[PDB]
Amino acid sequence: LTEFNPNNARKSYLFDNYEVDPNYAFKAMVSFGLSNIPYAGGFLSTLWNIFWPNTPNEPDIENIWEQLRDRIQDLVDESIIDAINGILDSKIKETRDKIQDINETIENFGYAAAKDDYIGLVTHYLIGLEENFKRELDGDEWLGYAILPLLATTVSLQITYMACGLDYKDEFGFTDSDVHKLTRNIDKLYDDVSSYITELAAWADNDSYNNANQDNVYDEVMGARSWCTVHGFEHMLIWQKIKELKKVDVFVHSNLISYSPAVGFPSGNFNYIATGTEDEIPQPLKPNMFGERRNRIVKIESWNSIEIHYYNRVGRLKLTYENGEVVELGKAHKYDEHYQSIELNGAYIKYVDVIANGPEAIDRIVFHFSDDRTFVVGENSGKPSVRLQLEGHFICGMLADQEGSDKVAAFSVAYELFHPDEFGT
């Protein structure tokens, strides 16, 4: 759709090397089961403290929407950000305050006493609230993509607060009719928004590709995919469970995979993954399913490369998974050296730091694990490091290409949402 579009000047699908996810606690806490969270109170209070984080006395912390606004400002002009701020300072802030008021009534008078104000919350604040962050899906959907995280956050608020009325139906004193109206509102919102996000993601898959070149097609397409996963499908997975179970108190173990930008020199092998479908991305980048969860790396082995201009670089890597598979990243070369191995022993990879330098080398990769340990491959030949990290997510896969050489020339990682069932609360 070629027309007047004042937003396309800042179009970029690149995923930041260090990317944020202000919804990570929402995701992890709701997906654990709100009743399973140690030390937590009633669901409407737990959820309020997630959307509007606060610590008693002092720090005023940005709420989830505001944190997302800070990220989105790189994608859109000041006028879009002003419009966003307008909605946050009005519609969202008033909803914050209404919920706080309900929680006070719950605490001081009980759930039945709060019924009217809860019904008011749903009918005057929540229903329709998602429309503030939707656009027309007309083939010029960049702005819709950019504000997706705001939409997702909002739908997460609506669906969870609506569902609370189901869990607490007896406490509030709802009738079967009241119940059926809330259930219908969840159903309808879920069905509408899941379709919307699915279509948006498909448009973005194609638009990112259309505007890319060989040097950046991995970063563009995998970036589009990752943004839609983190700020769209990861929310949808939770909303779907709530729709299916007709309660807010649910258990969800996320198997969705997102992707870092690549480091290093352009790779045909990386591009082949980007230009194929997400369904067919294999190990080592994307972990297989292993029953109801993803296949875990249990061991990393590495070799440094042949010395190049006084420094050994990253030679190759080898992953071992819990299902027993052993996967090579790069093949062996005659002057590989400095063999190392590390057992994860139940820890996860929190982030990596990567240094690239000539000649078409990944100089050094540092893995940082959850149990404080580190694993260092290669050597710094005198360049800065780039961190690959996604807030609230751990590294579940990775990819290397030696590009016909004796050392790794391109490297990237993949992410998955933190799992308290696997790693603790």
* Residue 269 belongs to domain spanning: 253-425
Q: What is the resolution of this structure in A?
A: 1.7
Task: Give how far the C-alpha of residue 78 lies from the chain's centroid of Cα atoms, to the nearest Å.
Answer: 25
Among 222, 252, 282, residue at a domain's last position: 252
Q: Which of 120, 66, 67, 69 is nearest to 98 (CA)?
A: 120
| Phi, psi (rounded to 5 degrees) for 357 | -160, 165
Is there a contact between 239 and 194 (Cβ–Cβ < 8 Å)? yes
| Phi, psi (rounded to 5 degrees) for 337 | -150, 180
Q: Looking at the structure, tell me whether residues 281 and 222 fall in a common domain.
A: no
Is there a contact between 337 and 330 (Cβ–Cβ < 8 Å)? no
Q: Looking at the structure, tell me whether residues 221 and 313 fall in a common domain.
A: no
Q: Which of 21, 12, 10 is nearest to 258 (CA)?
A: 21
Q: Looking at the structure, tell me whether residues 26 and 46 fall in a common domain.
A: yes
Residue 399: how many other CB atoms lie within 10 Å: 26
Domain of residue 5, CATH code: 1.20.190.10
Q: Looking at the structure, tell me whether residues 91 and 230 fall in a common domain.
A: yes
Q: Which of 168, 165, 260, 279 is nearest to 218 (CA)?
A: 260
Q: Looking at the structure, tell me whether residues 182 and 269 fall in a common domain.
A: no
Q: Looking at the structure, tell me whether residues 386 and 408 fall in a common domain.
A: yes
Q: Looking at the structure, tell me whether residues 221 and 279 fall in a common domain.
A: no
Q: Looking at the structure, tell me whether residues 198 and 114 fall in a common domain.
A: yes
Three-class SS state of 90: helix
Query: Whole-angstrom Cα distance, residue 275 to residue 269?
Result: 10
Q: Looking at the structure, tell me whether residues 324 and 239 fall in a common domain.
A: no
Beta pairing, strands 374-378 & 385-390 = unpaired
The number of distinct structural domains making up the chain is: 2
Find where tokens 């919920």 sit.
Answer: 99
Element housing 159 (H / E): helix 142-167
Q: Looking at the structure, tell me whether residues 248 and 114 fall in a common domain.
A: yes
Among 252, 276, 305, residue at a domain's last position: 252
Q: Looking at the structure, tell me whether residues 219 and 318 fall in a common domain.
A: no
**Structure solved using which method?**
X-ray
Q: Which of 304, 318, 296 is nearest to 369 (CA)?
A: 296
Residue 99 to residues 17, 49, 106, 127, 129, Cα–Cα distance (Å): 36, 11, 10, 14, 14
Query: Whole-angstrom Cα distance, residue 317 to residue 411?
Result: 11
Q: Count of residues for the chain?
A: 425
Among 210, 232, 252, residue at a domain's last position: 252
Query: Whole-angstrom Cα distance, residue 263 to residue 266?
Result: 9
Residue 272 to residues 76, 268, 382, 397, Cα–Cα distance (Å): 30, 6, 31, 17
Q: Looking at the structure, tell me whether residues 34 and 151 fall in a common domain.
A: yes
Is there a contact between 415 and 351 (Cβ–Cβ < 8 Å)? no
